[PDB]
């Protein structure tokens, strides 16, 4: 061994330890919010469905506890998705709103303690929103 | 060559001979969960294609036989990964359950002879399991 | 000077001359192979969908010719990766086969003359192949 | 199959043996025949834990000790 090779590798090494490295969390931010609502938006085809068939609302509830010819059971539990919570109350007017809490222990930093809301006017006119930044919420709601 | 040159040669070489390791087997062992469940998933598609369909039960395997107006099979072999071995059985109620079991030649020690199962009720209502540690199970299923 | 200082010197330059060297090529063999199918999948996303779009085969090629409402052309050149060839050809009647071949001008001399091969059934089953080493072979295809 | 032979370096032995549980130990063994009388019957050693965590150890004095090791 000799000197050169030595303070060769020496200075290729810091030369290697130099690489850049860009944000990576805007997309994980992103990809939160783009499965929070394709998760919880065709909970809206139960409610239409239970609205217009003849039940009444209230009785419209989650989790996994059978049906019948009274009460709906949308087939989804209330932490199914580890991300966050749902949450679903139909008034017995019809309107309601069924909302996604994003939990502090799963979720990420930024789209933490945030919520998202489908709400039903009492004419039967569906509206979204939600608290996260603008660059985060998907491109079908608003803030 | 002299002697001050060879001893902060050799001092060099112990010198450099310090950088630490960190772990490096986590990573691994949760890259192979978020693949085998990213494999196994998209089987639930065609099952309930076919129970909805009008074919019963049973009939429903894997591999690559072709396919028919009575039975059903799903283009991959039952050991397409090399990570694990895959297995289907639907019964004639249309309650099921299919799991993918990891072998001992091919996944990690940690993740050996494991399984993960997605089960579909008598009812109709699909939900998953696996036998894996908390910190290596997916963010979709329980333990 | 003297000749304790000399012998010490020599017999120091005589005991670094003494570190082993374990092999190192194995690892690039395996590299390779693992960057060959991870250039030359994701095809098979362009080829499913000029296949189910309306477009017939044959007209699917490679390079860089723009495209149009007949013809697809997906952006790689055919020698786009300097390890080795691609080459498409897609039947009329779908079924086809996307091949990798290995240079020797630029691979390793393992990896050398070797092709792998991604073959499309009538039916509609994506099965893949090679001709390298069993050790060699990545984790998702046969020999 | 490593490249290189128990007795490649003619200043000791060397040693390898993992367990099926992952964890192991590869250790150097230094030669009376080869080696410096201090640094004779001297074994240097690097354990991989259970979980996966590698560390290692030394038998000789504090001054010959690498600056990588303990004793």
Redesign the interface.
Known sequence: ???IE?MI??AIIGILAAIAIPQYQNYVARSEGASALATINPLKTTVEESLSRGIAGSKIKIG?T??TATETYV?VEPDA???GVIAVAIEDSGAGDITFTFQTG?SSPKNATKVITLNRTADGVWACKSTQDPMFTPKGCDN
């Open positions: 061994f000799t000197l030595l590798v020496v996994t059978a049906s087939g998705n580890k991300l799963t």
